Design a protein around this ligand. Structure first.
Ligand SMILES: [Cl-]
Ligand SMILES: [Cl-]
Ligand SMILES: [Cl-]
Lengths: 244, 244, 61, 244
């Protein structure tokens, strides 16, 4: 046979490049996944991740309370935190023994897979009682925030999209939903509506609290080939198109 | 300038009336919210509220167990209440140390925003094992209960719609889903189906147990300009159309 | 005051006492403890020192 | 340039030797620290360290009770240990459920920095009620124990001073204070008295219970360049004077 890395008959090298290309492109086909992650960052350094992975479209919707830190199998000041919630829902509505709950998120990062169409992204960032914009009567139920998403890039390739917002002020108390649609550069969609209804049931969800962004990078992002952007603006992910 | 409240050049007064009219009408546009609330009333006077707010259509679906009272950070007779559930699911199925759980709802109020089309409202009031009508094989999956909804009215304007039913008997043990569609007096809808799928992800949810109907009125209904009907048949809400 | 003495202590409430001993070991020497958190919320975020107007500022140490 | 390690123009080597010499000498200047450590060794192998670091003079003073083992966040037989204290303060004074408390120190090591003047060291080793010598009326308030301190040595240099005494008998129940003065080979001291008063406030204290002498060596002594002498008579510390 020819010697490796010297001719157009390195079929191991061609197949390696095809295998990676086929992953990148399959994910972009309508048979592929589109995925979203919400990361909620807490003052103790831990991070709640919620991920949804589904065909055609995907999203996540959480209450104010659901986004608060919950430490499984440890103390959570449960009763005092019920009272903190009452005061967050309406000023002076509760009788808590603290000014600021450390279970409140300090920041949110939303990441989508590179199979999303950025122009389809919509976010409903509500107040603590799940109202998008002060009162329901004046609320558009979403804002299309695609323009704000940064490309997460590795080796020149877009591996995902990131929108990051801090919640550093006492009044930053939110409920949150986000949604994106998988790329569809075709004009195909009539005939497939029941399949999209089935995708609503088929969407897989994951949620977990990791103890540190390091741990998120090491045990969540990296093992799964997920895109990420860390606090130091470092991009993670795996470039696949036309690559060995 | 002209003197306030004496001429057609009171533009502060015209803009105030327009601002309120525009809220009422925006909520009725297809760009607006439609919202639903389920209130479950407990014997200790507390009230669980579940609210969903979304574009195009909205609903809530809860199990028998999910509607039972849960007091965050306090004792809930957790083990005995598992046994009460077994006896509610099948006669004599559990080994509880009580005849009637005080965590069972005594009543349900369903309220919709005035942007719902009443004729689209559907309810699945199931038995304790989540069957609409005795056995699945004979169950229509919903009843269209719009005719029973009362108008909640302030200053002559419909501010919401209410259906209220007590559960005062021992055998009143229910699961519950409800759904309504936003007003659509146009013939527009083709082209918008993926947007409605995104609205399923974008819908915001809120749930909380308030200690008293007084507290619900003061800290939930009123601060948010929500419609309500209290036990004394008093209507709450804010009239907006053509009003200062 | 010591490092430990300046950490938050909530009288009559839970203070993650055991985990906070382990956090202290890791603060004293990298990787010295086996805590279940990255950042203790009992650590001060800031210090203000105030003196009365009867101090001589040039003597402050 | 000249080649490393072959001429009097290795200025990197001269500066390295100066940097170390300047540390050794600065510590001996009156601008330097003098430091003391009390190690209390427990039967479970753990060791309480108390350290004080201050200018001009330094010391530590602890009660009998303060020197007993305290395991943070674990059980400490608190009530029984109050009763053990009553019996230690006066024979048969308490009603404990044990003959010997394992929280009692088995030994004490006192170490001073090499900037102390050994002839200034004073110790008040009291009985369990904090009396130096049986009764206050006959007590000199200290003994000058410098003659008993061994030099801790590395590479020929004194890196600290150690006095070690076991408390292996049931009646070895002590309170303890120790004090040393920083070297002052000059005749300077008038003018500086308020500065010494400020040094009483400025002295920094550290205390911690380590689980093993190994851990003390690895995570306390060594990382901080502190002198130590272990149970096997091994000296630890860093020689600095005229050394690279
Ligand atoms: Cl395709
Ligand atoms: Cl419209
Ligand atoms: Cl000097």
């Amino acid at each position: 046979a020819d010697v490796a890395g010297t001719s157009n008959r390195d079929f191991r090298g061609r197949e390696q490049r095809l295998f990676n290309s086929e992953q990148y492109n399959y994910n972009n086909s309508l048979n592929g996944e589109v995925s979203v992650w919400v990361y909620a960052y807490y003052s103790d350094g831990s991070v709640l991740v919620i991920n949804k992975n589904s065909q055609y479209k995907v999203g996540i919707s959480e209450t104010f309370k659901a986004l608060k830190e919950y430490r499984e199998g440890q103390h959570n000041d449960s009763y005092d935190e019920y009272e903190v919630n009452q005061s967050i829902y309406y000023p002076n509505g509760g009788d808590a023994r603290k000014f600021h709950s450390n279970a409140k998120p300090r920041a949110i990062q939303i990441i989508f897979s590179p199979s999303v169409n950025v122009r389809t992204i919509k976010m409903a960032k509500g107040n603590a009682v799940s109202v998008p914009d002060e009162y329901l009567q004046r609320s558009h139920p979403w804002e299309a925030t695609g323009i704000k998403y940064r490309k997460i890039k590795r080796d020149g390739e877009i591996v995902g999209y990131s929108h990051y917002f801090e919640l550093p002020h006492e009044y930053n108390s939110i409920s949150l939903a986000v949604s994106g649609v998988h790329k569809n550069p075709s004009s195909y969609n009539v005939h497939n509506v029941m399949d999209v209804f089935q995708s609503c049931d088929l969407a897989l969800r994951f949620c977990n609290r990791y103890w540190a962004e390091l741990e998120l990078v090491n045990h969540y992002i990296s093992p799964n080939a997920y895109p990420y952007l860390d606090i130091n603006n470092h991009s993670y992910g795996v470039a696949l198109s036309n690559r060995q």
